Amino acid sequence: TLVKQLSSNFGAISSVLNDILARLDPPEAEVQIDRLITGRLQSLQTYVTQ
Amino acid sequence: FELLHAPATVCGPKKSTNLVKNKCVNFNFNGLTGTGVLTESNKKFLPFQ
């Protein structure tokens, strides 16, 4: 389940980060990257606690 | 633009390079923005994939 959590949008335009990067300008990338960062950080904290 | 990963046709106007195997490179196929080592494999495909 930890690994499978990586392939989720969490609300951004797309899941894979390296496709967000080449697809939005730097003034717009951080918002999507932030959505991914918060989601993945939450998933990792959950796994560590369990 | 209908953005997907299925076989694309409308590609940008940039020339291509050659390929180097067995060495860690950052390939750019028709999309596919990744990084790894390119080794000739044996997985027998089907005429469309």
Swiss-Prot record, chain A:
Effect caused by changing residue 9 to K: In strain: Omicron/BA.1, Omicron/BA.2, Omicron/BA.2.12.1, Omicron/BA.2.75, Omicron/BA.4, Omicron/BA.5, Omicron/BQ.1.1, Omicron/XBB.1.5, Omicron/EG.5.1
Coiled coil: 1-33
Function: Subunit of the fusion protein that is processed upon entry into the host cell. Mediates fusion of the virion and cellular membranes by functioning as a class I viral fusion protein. Contains a viral fusion peptide that is unmasked after S2 cleavage. This cleavage can occur at the cell membrane by host TMPRSS2 or during endocytosis by host CSTL. In either case, this triggers an extensive and irreversible conformational change that leads to fusion of the viral envelope with the cellular cytoplasmic membrane, releasing viral genomic RNA into the host cell cytoplasm.
Name this polypeptide is given: Spike protein S2'
Source organism per UniProt: Severe acute respiratory syndrome coronavirus 2 (2019-nCoV)
Gene: S
